[PDB]
Design a protein around this ligand. Structure first.
Ligand SMILES: [K+]
Ligand SMILES: [K+]
Ligand SMILES: [Mg+2]
Ligand SMILES: [Mg+2]
Ligand SMILES: [Mg+2]
Ligand SMILES: [Mg+2]
Ligand SMILES: [Zn+2]
Ligand SMILES: [Zn+2]
Ligand SMILES: [Zn+2]
Lengths: 56, 101, 118, 105
RNA sequence: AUGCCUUAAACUUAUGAGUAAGGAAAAUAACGAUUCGGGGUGACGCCCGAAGAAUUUUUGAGC
RNA sequence: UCGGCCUCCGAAAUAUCCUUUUCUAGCAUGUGUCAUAUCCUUAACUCAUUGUCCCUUUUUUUU
RNA sequence: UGUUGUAUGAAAGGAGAGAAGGUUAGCACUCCCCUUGACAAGGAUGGAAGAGGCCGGCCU
């Protein structure tokens, strides 16, 4: 959903876009290698399969 | 099943308080309505941005042109005209009947 | 529901001298005789039939009297169907309680025997 | 019954037959339909205990299992003196229930 | 009235079949065709039928 | 020619806290109306039933 | 030539176990502990608080 906040100062908005992009990379890489572990059989935990399905 | 008067009133007020991402909280207020039916009723009919006015001449011309363009695709068409897809659909059929006479 | 309470409370205290409460409650029950809904209308009639056996046929006839010959059929038939209930339940006791109607030109209406003096 | 305006009492001259009530109707008053304070025994007219009907329920018509009484309030109002209190017509409610179950079942 | 995880839940927000009878709103249909007769009603409601040129001024009695 | 895997314990489930005694542990100090939905309500309202419909064809169990 | 130097558990009597509809899952931030050989894991997600300004109160 596109995020815009109309009043917000641009130092603050630049900082927020910076850190949201960092969290997005951490999230997406974790999705990437937990899928590999699920496919190879390395995980046996069912909650990590549920979380990966949700992220995917 | 069908929407009473008082149910629509509850649904408008509850969306005004709880917003548009909590349909499970809104379904708890109504009788025998699920969350999906509440959402569908809101976007179909009860949303204030839905315009229930008469059709302008411009809006009709865009309707006839876009219905020629992408036939039967009313969800794609409908935000370009700014009516609900059901509204767009029945008004198209109205004009087609009218041109038959 | 209050008329149902009056019906049942009326028949319980029969013979015990509680007639002032019951007559007081008749003053509230009685304007509801012009209701038209059947459930309410049969609860009111039940209350009056209970009250006839607790405060007597004389009071109940004194309530009906003025509307038995009233100009409107609406007031009249409701009043007549209260009278019939009093008449069926207590036909004999009403002999002492009827009013005095005067004689007109060709018919005599005074019950002269009761007017006898010893 | 008092709950059904279309039901109709027999009201003929009651006789020496004692009216009875089926298990469903046990303990209630035939006129005003109450559960409390039984005052007098119910008598039914000759025709209403004719033949096979001898001993059926007064109020509904099922196999009778105990004697029927009038309550105290119907005695004081002398409702016990109006006649045979046997109900002579099934009415709309009983008939509708039959066709509804039969449609379904 | 605290941040996060798969909106935390890939959990649920149930309530049978009928009988008889009421109350309240939403919605919706009309406004002045006058009087007379008949229907109806306590009374109305309501209903059925019927129908700027002429004596004191500016369109002349003047010739 | 031969070829021989393992064996079990507790926790994440029946809370927690306060008051008075009991047991023990550990300490520390001291020059209105027509025509339509709906909502609310009323009546100890009911939860199927088996009770000869035998009527009908020129139709009738044979010494 | 005494006394408040404290705590645990139990019994009896009371209170009752997070989630802006119901039923619940958890992981933490601070400081208060308990089980534990713990740099692990549990103890209801262990329990308890959590916006700003002025002097428990007042204002947004
Ligand atoms: K913690
Ligand atoms: K929990
Ligand atoms: Mg746990
Ligand atoms: Mg855990
Ligand atoms: Mg923990
Ligand atoms: Mg738990
Ligand atoms: Zn019975
Ligand atoms: Zn009775
Ligand atoms: Zn009979």
């Amino acid at each position: 959903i596109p995020w815009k906040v109309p009043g917000l100062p641009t130092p603050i908005e630049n900082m927020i876009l910076r850190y949201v992009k960092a969290k997005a990379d951490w999230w997406t890489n974790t999705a990437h290698y937990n899928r590999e572990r699920i496919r190879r059989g390395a995980t046996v935990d069912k909650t990590v399969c549920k979380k990966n399905l949700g992220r995917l | 099943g069908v929407w009473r008067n008082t149910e629509d009133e509850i649904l408008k007020a509850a969306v005004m308080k709880y917003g548009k991402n909590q349909w499970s909280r809104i379904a708890s207020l109504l009788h025998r309505k699920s969350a999906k039916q509440c959402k569908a009723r809101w976007y179909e009919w009860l949303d204030p941005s839905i315009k229930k006015t008469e059709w302008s001449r411009e809006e009709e011309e865009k309707l006839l042109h876009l219905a020629k363009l992408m036939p039967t695709q009313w969800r794609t068409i409908a935000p370009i005209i700014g009516r609900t897809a059901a509204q767009c659909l029945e008004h198209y059929e109205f004009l087609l009947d009218k041109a038959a006479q | 529901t209050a008329s149902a309470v009056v019906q049942h409370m009326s028949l319980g205290v029969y013979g015990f001298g509680c007639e002032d409460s019951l007559n007081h409650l008749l003053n509230y029950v009685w304007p509801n005789v012009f209701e038209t809904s059947p459930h309410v209308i049969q609860a009111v009639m039940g209350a009056l039939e209970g009250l006839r056996v607790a405060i007597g046929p004389c009071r109940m006839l004194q309530y009906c009297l003025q509307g038995l010959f009233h100009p409107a059929r609406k007031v009249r038939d409701v009043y007549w169907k209260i009278y019939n209930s009093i008449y069926i339940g207590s036909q004999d006791a009403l002999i002492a309680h009827y009013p005095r109607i005067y004689n007109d030109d060709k018919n005599t209406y005074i019950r002269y025997e009761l007017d006898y003096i010893l | 019954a008092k709950h059904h305006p279309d039901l109709i009492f027999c009201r003929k001259q009651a006789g020496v037959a004692i009216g009875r009530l089926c298990e469903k109707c046990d303990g209630k008053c035939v006129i005003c339909d109450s559960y409390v304070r039984p005052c007098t025994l119910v008598r039914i007219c000759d025709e209403c205990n004719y033949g096979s009907y001898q001993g059926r329920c007064v109020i509904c018509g099922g196999p009778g299992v105990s004697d029927a009484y009038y309550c105290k309030e119907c005695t004081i109002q002398e409702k016990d003196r109006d006649g045979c209190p046997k109900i002579v017509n099934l009415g709309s409610s009983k008939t509708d229930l039959f066709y509804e179950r039969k449609k379904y079942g």
